[PDB]
Structure 1
Amino acid sequence: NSNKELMQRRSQAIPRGVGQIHPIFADRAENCRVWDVEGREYLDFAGGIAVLNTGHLHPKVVAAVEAQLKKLSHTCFQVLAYEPYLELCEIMNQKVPGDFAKKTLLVTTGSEAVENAVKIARAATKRSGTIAFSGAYHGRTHYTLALTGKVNPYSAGMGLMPGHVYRALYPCPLHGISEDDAIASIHRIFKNDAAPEDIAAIVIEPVQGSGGFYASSPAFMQRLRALCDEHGIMLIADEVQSGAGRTGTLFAMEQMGVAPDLTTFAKSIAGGFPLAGVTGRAEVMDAVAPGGLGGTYAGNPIACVAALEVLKVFEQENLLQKANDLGQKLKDGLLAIAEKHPEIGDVRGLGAMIAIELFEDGDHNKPDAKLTAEIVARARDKGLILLSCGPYYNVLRILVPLTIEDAQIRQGLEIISQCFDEAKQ
């Protein structure tokens, strides 16, 4: 077939609303390699957007999936239960940070995970409002669009999203927002628009993904934890992207020295299959009356075993450790590039959640959304699949599977090195 031929049909059958980063149709993939319908091979650094921390179709994961496929694919837990769902919950309850009893709900998409986390926080505290941070991303349902700190294009032309969501400033010294500023912004909400007694939860990404890979410091999370504690507000850690080991630990919160009340997870949790969930303080999770929580596909059988296997593979294969190594390699590699390309104004990242911000002529005030896109474009023509993000589209985030070999690591770095040289000429 042909990529362009498939793109033409795409434009005829699918709405333009559905964006398309790379105009390539994949055919097969394996770990870090992807082959398009034209037979061309690529080194995947987007990882399906952090969904493949274990790589494309990890064998142990596929094996489990094939086995379950001989048994059953769906029943809808709420009608007839099944062990995989039960077993995954039990494991999340103990792996998700929190020195106390927890319970886990399994849904299907990261959006639904956040939707439920807030629902549960509201039923628990008996309050309606929530607070979210600038540059945050939490999903594409009406309510999660309101939580998401970005209107364009996610809400464009649709009108105002749900109310009673209040905006706080995410800490980010790189741009003049001090942890004191972030904390102050929360009190501002309490004083100006919504008293604590009306705030059911504060939703935050320990490390923002779509936001441009900006991380919270242990100190700030601790203050946030104290503030929430003082007002009986549930702290929700959206770990949909930062979770499943991307930061060096299974969940980023672990590195914050403090525990959330509720945690959402998805993407890499199932290494390539549709699964999401909420894990939180047991009594909070139970605040909802029976029949209150649910969903048809929720905690799908095949995805459950894949999740279980992903968790096994993480231990058997030492991914958490590799996640740190990989980040250090990419970070050193990228810094070597930064010594001959001032346009790269910052190399940051926790574990393997690495990213670089492109500024025009060094200046930390001139986002280069054009060079960024050029780098992506050039990178693709060289067989490297990259992704960008951040409120000013000048951030390159690397989400390559943790299972990547050193050769592919050097390979990718090299390709990114040229993209810049060939882009200054």
Structure 2
Amino acid sequence: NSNKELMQRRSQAIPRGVGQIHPIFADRAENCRVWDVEGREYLDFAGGQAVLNTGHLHPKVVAAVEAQLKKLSHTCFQVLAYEPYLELCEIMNQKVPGDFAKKTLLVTTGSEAVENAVKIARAATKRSGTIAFSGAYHGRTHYTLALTGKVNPYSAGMGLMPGHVYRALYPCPLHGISEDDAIASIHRIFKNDAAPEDIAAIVIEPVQGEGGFYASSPAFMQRLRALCDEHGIMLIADEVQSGAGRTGTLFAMEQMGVAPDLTTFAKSIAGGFPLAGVTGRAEVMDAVAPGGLGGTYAGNPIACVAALEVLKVFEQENLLQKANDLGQKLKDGLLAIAEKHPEIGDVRGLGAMIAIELFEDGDHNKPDAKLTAEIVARARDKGLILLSCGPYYNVLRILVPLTIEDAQIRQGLEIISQCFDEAKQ
């Protein structure tokens, strides 16, 4: 029952392919606190990878889950239905941006959600190709690995992933890719490899997660929407990570000024329970013939009641406003730290989807991956759990539960401050 001991057993029974960011075995948790098997307490700034916007075991969520456990945990919706699945669908049809009739499909994981959105876009348009962006992340199934703009390590050593997935450039001025370059990269696909008539959908993260927490501007998103409309291409917004309130609105697309045809959600939607889904223009969703959509565990009963509670908690605890306030506080603190450390070349984020990006001597073409990894390690040593990301591994992101305590905001920022001070020594 020591972390080391458990890691030894892990090497024996579990594949090295399953990475381990922190060699620690968590035992119990509560809101933003996690205790490992040795009793040490940590402040969780990773949030189970953006899955815990309402924190570990939110009391209301757990209470709803415990009540559902008295009724049933599974029937397989496609065989025998149940109300929690229906209710969530009804609520998502209203909450997802788009001033038009929508329908919702529930599945189990974010990769399944993206898979289903594409199968739906293909059926609706009678086309087979898709376009995804550089640095994108959409899942670990063969097809979402192809959609994912990163081979190593997600699909490394496995041979080539499915074809007919084309690569566009994600707008990112910080790294010299203008919105014009991004829109131009799409037309390039049209002229060089796949005409519009063969593209069923363009998949994009309103705010890239693993890609580096880079956000699309409303203007860029508006150009994209116009491009899709012109060519009858479905716009799929993958909000698995940006969704469930992380950016200050339930869905980031609300802040773009345009609505997508399809939206994928997961992670924080059920606050720590396995659930995912796709909500979209009704006519598009209905394109698949009966029997064409499913999944054994899809819209698991317990996960659904959990999601329903999460939605009510956002409303009751005013978490969207808190997300925004937390974001301002984190960025202000991060900018203060930045004044003493030029390596921090950018502080950014919508709502609580905050990140800082490190550069050697603030040199924007020199991603500082060693410092980023060093800060993560030093933070773990000070009891703070962090995650990094970015195609060059030089981005630190903050995904702490929105339910965080005032004291914990100070605590996390203080610990980060120390890490940069002690790394520079």
TM superposition score normalised by structure 2: 1.00
Q: C-alpha separation between the residues in 1 aligned to 2:154 and 2:403?
A: 32
Q: Which runs of 5+ in 2 are unaligned?
A: none
Count of paired positions? 425
Shift of 1:202: 0.1
The aligned residue for residue 33 of structure 2 is 33
Q: Following TM superposition, by how much is the alpha carbon of 1:172 offset from its aligned partner in structure 2, in angstroms? A: 0.4
Alpha-carbon distance, 1:155 to partner: 1.1
* Alpha-carbon distance in 2 for matches of 1:378, 1:215: 28
Aligned mates of 2:338, 2:72 — CA distance in 1: 52
1:147-186 superposed matches below 5 A: 147-186=147-186
Q: Take 1:115 and 1:50, find their aligned partners in 2: how far apart are those partners?
A: 20
Identity %: 100
String of CA shifts for 1:368-415, please: whole Å, max 9, x gaps.
Answer: 110100000000011000000000001000000000011000011000
The CA deviation string for residues 155-179 of structure 1, in whole angstroms up to 9 with x for no partner, is 1111000000000000000010000
Q: 2:266 matched to 1:266?
A: yes
Deviation at 1:32, TM superposition (A): 0.2
Q: What is the rounded CA distance, in whole Å, between the counterparts of 2:270 and 2:157 in structure 1?
A: 34
Tell me the SS of whatever aligns to 2:124: helix
Deviation at residue 327 of structure 1 after TM alignment = 0.4
Give matches, 1:188-337, under 5 Å: 188-337=188-337
Note the alpha carbon deviations across 1:101-157, whole angstroms, 9 max, x for none.
000000000000000000000000000000000000000000000000000011111
The offset of 1:227, in angstroms, is 0.4
Q: Give the Cα separation in 1 of the matches to 2:377 and 2:141.
A: 30
Q: CA offsets per residue over residues 256-303 of structure 1, 9 Å max, x none?
A: 000000000000000000000000000100000000000000000000
Deviation at 1:318, TM superposition (A): 0.2
Unaligned segments of structure 1, at least 5 residues: none
For residues 315-371 of structure 1, the C-alpha deviation after alignment (integer angstroms, 9 at most, x for no partner) is: 000000000000000000000000000111100000000000011111001111101
1:165-198 deviation per Cα after TM superposition (whole angstroms, max 9, x unaligned): 0000000000100000000000000111100000
| Separation (CA, whole Å) in 2 of partners of 1:362 and 1:213 | 18
Q: Any idea what the Cα deviations from partners look like across 1:188-230, whole Å, max 9, x if unmatched?
A: 0011110000000000000000000000000000000000000
Q: How far, CA to CA, are the matches of 2:256 and 2:36 in structure 1?
A: 41
Query: What's the CA shift for 1:74?
Result: 0.2
Runs ≥4 in structure 1, deviation > 3 angstroms? none
Q: 1:76-125 CA distances to partner (integer Å, 9 max, x unpaired)?
A: 00010000000000000000000000000000000000000000000000
Q: 1:215-258: per-residue Cα shift (whole Å, max 9, x none)?
A: 00000000000000000000000000000000000000000000
Alignment-derived partner of residue 59 in structure 2 = 59
TM value normalised by structure 1: 1.00
